[PDB]
Design a protein around this ligand. Structure first.
Ligand SMILES: NC(=O)c1ccc[n+]([C@@H]2O[C@H](COP(=O)([O-])OP(=O)(O)OC[C@H]3O[C@@H](n4cnc5c(N)ncnc54)[C@H](O)[C@@H]3O)[C@@H](O)[C@H]2O)c1
Ligand SMILES: Nc1nc2c(ncn2[C@@H]2O[C@H](COP(=O)(O)OP(=O)(O)OP(=O)(O)O)[C@@H](O)[C@H]2O)c(=O)[nH]1
Ligand SMILES: Nc1nc2c(ncn2[C@@H]2O[C@H](COP(=O)(O)OP(=O)(O)OP(=O)(O)O)[C@@H](O)[C@H]2O)c(=O)[nH]1
Ligand SMILES: Nc1ncnc2c1ncn2[C@@H]1O[C@H](COP(=O)(O)OP(=O)(O)OP(=O)(O)O)[C@@H](O)[C@H]1O
Ligand SMILES: O=c1[nH]cnc2c1ncn2[C@@H]1O[C@H](COP(=O)(O)O)[C@@H](O)[C@H]1O
Lengths: 481, 81
């Protein structure tokens, strides 16, 4: 009736200061009494923000133009916009990430009935928004006249717009001051796709569109805030001129910022957290890269709402080998997540993650989420071009420290196709490994971590040479990518 | 108000006689409250001779004919022939 406990507990590993990393250890299996896809993955990003999935894309220029922010916020995660570009560009990026799906559309493009219909085509090319309400003065404070739609533009285009738009007498509309659950039903039961909202005075105040309901069925895990639109993050630097960048990003409606730096502990960074949290009380803030609890105290004391950990561990970096300063990633995440847990802030792991197993190890060590670099490079919506090399379709992977000194390299990654299939493969290979661990949710997994129920063992270099081994002549992997 | 000390001190590394080299260890980061190029580098070569920079060229035949001695002494260092 007694079975000996086997394997080192969580704390017994990182007592002997060998500086272990994600390769150096394994997690012993438990008991299974649930289906592989039963588990929850709900995870905090910062004190006030929760995500239906622990994936975050890195704020590198070679990873996160707006199209990745969209395609990963649509699947639980969150996307941080790279900062090494002019503030106006970065504000446009975060603006068109916010506007991809909507509750009450509050600044629609509206035209006056005296416009030329070729100007509807110009606006459609300028924005992509193809159906447009019409009001007298041409702004948001006039009476309804009608809607023009792409179904009104198939037939040169010199005609005046009142000739082709639908009249307001026939246009079905809903009275204003209605909650987003009755107007939704009133669209569903009056099956025309672009239902406007008008006050008693019959002037325009908002509109809604059927495709936003359709997107809510197609992407059920997407992370939307109270106004029912996607969550978005900006990286910003710590310099004096990023104090201007902050206001453009905040006018564009960003909801999280990461104070991007190599070494989070600086007096410049601690003063920056105070400036943000005094001027903009709503914004959640994430602190610059920390590796030891002795520097996570200054960050939490400042008022930061979350932390990202790890420095000089990463594929693209050369920062340990220039600065001499760093810490092995596996030790760092645990040894700072245990401390930061007391004050109730989420640690987020950061880089050096190159397989799904490393993601599970980073979650079973304290990290509330995991931030991906190289594993999302060369997916379809990572920015740039596919320069065919010697027999390979591959895409750029530039480190920001790679062009006073250079502390990252510039290289390439082979094609991985659309992130829209890649993120479900990560989700289904995380929960399928959380089943083998024996945990019904990620909250239960970190409870097992801190209770001693999880048990690890160290792996000799001689035992790292395992799986896909040198005994094969040659091989092919074939994941679902 | 208390934060646990993390990491081996200087002496605690080289007590267990595993013969570490520069590759085998890291230095944990501290606090920052000065500009990166503010810090001083003045370093002794021998009891009476001090250099504005800690760099020296090795006295190998393939490294230090006079042109290197000049070009390195001109930038803080010293050159051995
Ligand atoms: N390799 C890494 O560790 C790593 C990780 C993430 C991002 N980065 C990127 O590379 C750069 C790394 O340098 P950084 O993190 O120190 O940020 P930084 O590039 O803004 O700092 C440049 C230098 O000036 C100093 N500095 C920073 N903020 C300052 C301020 N307000 N006033 C005066 N001096 C200031 C820093 O000490 C540093 O020596 C960043 O620009 C960041 O975009 C590097
Ligand atoms: N780019 C952009 N999109 C907007 C704007 N306002 C709303 N949208 C969103 O654009 C999306 C598409 O709107 P639709 O009117 O359905 O576009 P459509 O071309 O008429 O219909 P589809 O052919 O099905 O796309 C919806 O999710 C809207 O909420 C805007 O100002 N700019
Ligand atoms: N117009 C619009 N309606 C949406 C959108 N997303 C969800 N809705 C619907 O708007 C209503 C919002 O009510 P909530 O109580 O916030 O809905 P919810 O229960 O959180 O459901 P989800 O938002 O689907 O998780 C529900 O009927 C939702 O299905 C969206 O982007 N646009
Ligand atoms: N609420 C409405 N009531 C009446 N007519 C509408 C309404 N909304 C749009 N229309 C008009 O009805 C026609 C089709 O509207 P619909 O909502 O289906 O356009 P759409 O979804 O953008 O069309 P499509 O997807 O084919 O491009 C167009 O003439 C359009 O201007
Ligand atoms: O040298 C570097 N410069 C900038 N960011 C880097 C560097 N090395 C790693 N990163 C960080 O670590 C992640 C990259 O993950 P990686 O591809 O596994 O290395 C990013 O989210 C960055 O925060």
């Amino acid at each position: 009736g007694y079975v000996p406990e086997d394997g080192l507990t969580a704390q017994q590993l990182f007592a002997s200061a060998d500086g272990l990393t994600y390769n150096d250890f394994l997690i012993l299996p438990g008991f299974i009494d649930f289906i592989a896809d039963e588990v929850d993955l709900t995870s905090a990003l910062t004190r006030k923000i929760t995500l239906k999935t622990p994936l975050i894309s890195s704020p590198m220029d070679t990873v996160t133009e707006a199209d990745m922010a969209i395609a990963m916020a649509l699947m639980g995660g969150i996307g941080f916009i790279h900062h090494n570009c002019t503030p106006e560009f970065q504000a446009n990026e975060v603006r068109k990430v916010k506007k991809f799906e909507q509750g009450f559309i509050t600044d629609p493009v509206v035209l006056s009935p005296s416009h030329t219909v070729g100007d509807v085509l110009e606006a459609k090319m300028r924005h992509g928004f193809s159906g447009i309400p019409i009001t007298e003065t041409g702004t948001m404070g006039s009476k309804l006249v009608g809607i023009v739609t792409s179904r009104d533009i198939d037939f040169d285009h010199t005609t005046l717009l009142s000739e082709v738009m639908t009249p307001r007498i026939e246009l079905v509309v809903a009275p204003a001051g209605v909650t987003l659950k009755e107007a939704n039903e009133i669209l569903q039961r009056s099956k025309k796709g672009k239902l406007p909202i008008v006050n008693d005075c019959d002037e325009l105040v908002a509109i809604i569109a059927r495709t936003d309901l359709k997107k809510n069925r197609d992407y059920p895990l997407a992370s939307k805030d109270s106004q029912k639109q996607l969550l978005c993050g900006a990286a910003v630097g710590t310099r004096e001129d990023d104090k201007y960048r902050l206001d453009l990003l905040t006018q564009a409606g960003v909801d999280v910022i990461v104070l991007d730096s190599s070494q989070g502990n600086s007096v410049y960074q601690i003063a920056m957290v105070h400036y943000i949290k005094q001027k903009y009380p709503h914004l959640q803030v994430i602190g610059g890269n920390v590796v030891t609890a002795a520097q996570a105290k200054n960050l939490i004391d400042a008022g930061v709402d979350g932390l990202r950990v790890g420095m000089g561990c990463g594929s693209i970096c050369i920062t340990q080998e220039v600065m001499a300063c760093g810490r092995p990633q596996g030790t760092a995440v645990y040894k700072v997540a245990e401390y930061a847990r007391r004050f109730g802030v989420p640690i987020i792991a950061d880089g050096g993650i190159q397989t799904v197993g490393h993601v599970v190890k980073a979650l079973a060590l304290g990290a509330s989420t995991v931030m991906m670099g190289s594993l999302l490079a060369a997916t379809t919506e990572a920015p740039g071009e596919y320069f065919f090399s010697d027999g390979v379709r591959l895409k750029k992977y530039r480190g920001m420290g790679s062009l006073k000194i250079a502390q990252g390299v510039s290289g390439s990654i082979q094609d991985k196709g659309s992130i829209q299939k890649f993120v479900p493969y990560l989700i289904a290979g995380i929960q399928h490994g959380c089943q083998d661990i024996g945990a019904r949710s990620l909250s239960v997994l970190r409870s097992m971590m801190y209770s001693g129920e999880l048990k690890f063992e160290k792996r000799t270099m001689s035992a790292q040479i395992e799986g896909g081994v040198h005994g094969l002549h040659s091989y092919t992997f074939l994941p679902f990518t």
